[PDB]
């Protein structure tokens, strides 16, 4: 029956050597955490020390998950993954689970319980090398390589996919309504059920996964830490590409109309049909900015037709699973953060807003990192792939502080907007 003796073969692409990425500085406390963790990971055969014959390196650090006090280990496998051959197999990313984003509720489960009990290809382990650095580099950094499937790797879920399907067999047959997705170390579970009823279905699958792993005799014991007891709640049943809205006023100043026209002219790149001739006609002349201009009957109509156009959503807007997803974020002040997700300029697959005041608002960066997580998570639910971010932050600031607030086992790619969007208030 059982035969986990064989290791699933993995390779890279020709011309691409393994990941050689510098380890970035860590703080004392996160160093201690990684010391004790890796001490036990080696004592559980998951990793093992290596000599200087191994030149490869992938950065590593330490986070703390939501509502938890236990230091966890994250490995920034972003360079290995993209160097890791496009995992051509039964799973390159699952058949598009579009029912997932329609469900009333969606709970996210950390299935980092994990990919242990599964060895790794001996010739490939060298490519998962990492260093635990020391303060001031006073002692040589502790080096390791993974002996089993590591968390954060893109090949890890695509290898366990043959194993994970069988674990979800009593389930998925009992509740054919429930959609189940898997991205990285995360297993997303969605349902059209009432919140009380929905919360119960998760506890069922939780006690159910206490069978194939975590607890129970062996049979089926083994596997990496059972840190799954938590689960965030998502409601994609409450979302959209938010409408562009114009002011409704009884009196308009020259400034008001100057802004209105600015906003409509911008929107016209998105909605062909927008006109501003009649609104601009009121402006003509050099009136003071605070002077009230009464709307003429021609201008009022043009405003009305503009509302119409904007009420109707954008046309010709389709997803393309080959192209990259791009997320832009703007800081609006007062803990408000707007964002857009698109593939083509002015073709938004999704816009939204974020305003959560927790560990805030005196730290923009803490707010921004959480915003990035939220937007990435939504983006995992909708298209099954993270977007490349455009963060309104100087590279240096972000690189110094983001790891202090990050709580996700995955990490998106990002770049840095250095020029202020003129279009900032238009997206509020």
Residue numbers at the binding site for another protein (CB under 8 A)? 25-28, 31, 51-55, 57, 135-141, 143, 253-255, 258-259, 261-262, 265, 276, 280-291, 330-331, 333, 363-368, 391-394, 396-401, 419-422, 424
**Closer CB to another protein, 87 or 144, in the complex:** 144
**Closer CB to another protein, 52 or 196, in the complex:** 52
- The nearest distance, CB 126 to another protein, in angstroms, is 11
184 in Cβ contact with 386 (< 8 Å): no
Q: Report the largest interatomic distance among the alpha carbons of the chain, rounded to a whole angstrom.
A: 87
- The nearest distance, CB 46 to another protein, in angstroms, is 21
Strand order in the sheet with 47-48: 47-48, 142-146, 130-132
- The nearest distance, CB 289 to another protein, in angstroms, is 4
- The nearest distance, CB 214 to another protein, in angstroms, is 34
243 in Cβ contact with 252 (< 8 Å): no
**Closer CB to another protein, 3 or 286, in the complex:** 286
**Closer CB to another protein, 194 or 415, in the complex:** 415
- The nearest distance, CB 295 to another protein, in angstroms, is 14
- The nearest distance, CB 52 to another protein, in angstroms, is 4
Q: What distance in Å separates the CA atoms of residue 84 and residue 94, rounded to the nearest whole number?
A: 18
In 168-296, alpha helices (H): 195-212, 254-267, 277-283
Question: Of how many residues is the chain composed?
Answer: 428
Q: What distance in Å separates the CA atoms of residue 128 and residue 30, rounded to the nearest whole number?
A: 20
DSSP class of 252: E
Is 121 annotated among the ligand-binding residues?
no
Sign of the torsion formed by the C-alpha atoms of 84, 88, 90 and 94: positive
Is 67 annotated among the ligand-binding residues?
no
Q: What distance in Å separates the CA atoms of residue 189 and residue 158, rounded to the nearest whole number?
A: 18
**Closer CB to another protein, 220 or 259, in the complex:** 259
**Closer CB to another protein, 7 or 330, in the complex:** 330
Is 177 annotated among the ligand-binding residues?
no
Report the half-sphere exposure of 361 (CA within 13 A, side-chain side): 13
Non-local (6+) Cβ contacts of 84 within 8 A are 10, 12, 127, 153, 154, 155
**Closer CB to another protein, 227 or 346, in the complex:** 346
**Closer CB to another protein, 54 or 163, in the complex:** 54
**What is the Rg, in whole angstroms, of the alpha carbon atoms belonging to the chain?**
26
DSSP class of 278: H
The answer, yes or no, to whether the previous bond of 361 is cis (omega within 30 of 0) is yes
- The nearest distance, CB 425 to another protein, in angstroms, is 10
- The nearest distance, CB 363 to another protein, in angstroms, is 6
Structure tokens at 408: 């996700």
Backbone angles phi, psi at 233, to 5 degrees: -115, 125
Sign of the torsion formed by the C-alpha atoms of 364, 369, 371 and 372: positive
Annotated binding-site ranges for Mg(2+): 110, 185-186
Annotated binding site: 110, 185-186
């Amino acid at each position: 029956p059982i035969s986990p003796i064989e290791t699933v073969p993995v390779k890279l692409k020709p011309g691409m050597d393994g990941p050689k990425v510098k380890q970035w500085p860590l703080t004392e406390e996160k160093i201690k955490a990684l010391v004790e963790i890796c001490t036990e990971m080696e004592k559980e055969g998951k990793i093992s020390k290596i000599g200087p014959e191994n030149p490869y390196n992938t950065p590593v650090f330490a986070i703390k998950k939501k509502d938890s006090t236990k230091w966890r280990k994250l490995v920034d496998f972003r360079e290995l993954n993209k160097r890791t051959q496009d995992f051509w197999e039964v799973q390159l990313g699952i058949p598009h689970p579009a029912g997932l984003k329609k469900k009333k509720s969606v709970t996210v489960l950390d299935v980092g319980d994990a990919y242990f009990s599964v060895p790794l290809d001996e010739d490939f382990r060298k490519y998962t090398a990492f260093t635990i650095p020391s303060i001031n580099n006073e002692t040589p950094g502790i080096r390791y390589q993974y002996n089993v499937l590591p968390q954060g790797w893109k090949g890890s879920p695509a290898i366990f996919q043959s194993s994970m399907t069988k674990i979800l067999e009593p389930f998925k047959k009992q509740n054919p309504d429930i959609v189940i997705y898997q991205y990285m170390d995360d297993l997303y579970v969605g349902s059209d059920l009432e919140i009380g009823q929905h919360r119960t279905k998760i506890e069922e699958l939780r006690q159910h996964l206490l069978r194939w792993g975590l607890t129970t005799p062996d049979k089926k014991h083994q596997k990496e830490p059972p840190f799954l007891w938590m689960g965030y709640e998502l409601h994609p049943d409450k979302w959209t590409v938010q409408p562009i809205v114009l002011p409704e006023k009884d009196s308009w100043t020259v400034n008001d109309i100057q802004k209105l026209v600015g906003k409509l002219n911008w929107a016209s790149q998105i909605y062909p049909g927008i006109k501003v001739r009649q609104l601009s006609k009121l402006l003509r002349g050099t009136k003071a900015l605070t002077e009230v201009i009464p709307l003429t009957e021609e201008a009022e109509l043009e405003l009305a037709e503009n509302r119409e156009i904007l009420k109707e959503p954008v046309h010709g807007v389709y997803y393309d699973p080959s192209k990259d997803l791009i997320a832009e974020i703007q800081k609006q002040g007062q803990g408000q953060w707007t964002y857009q997700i698109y593939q083509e300029p002015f073709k938004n697959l999704k816009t939204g807003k974020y305003a959560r005041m927790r560990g805030a608002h005196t730290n923009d960066v803490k707010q921004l990192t959480e915003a990035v997580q939220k937007i990435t998570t939504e983006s995992i639910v909708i298209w099954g792939k993270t977007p490349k971010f455009k963060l309104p932050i100087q590279k240096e600031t972000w690189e110094t502080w983001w790891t202090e607030y990050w709580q996700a086992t995955w990490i998106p790619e990002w770049e840095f907007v250095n020029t202020p969007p003129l279009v900032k208030l238009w997206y509020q």
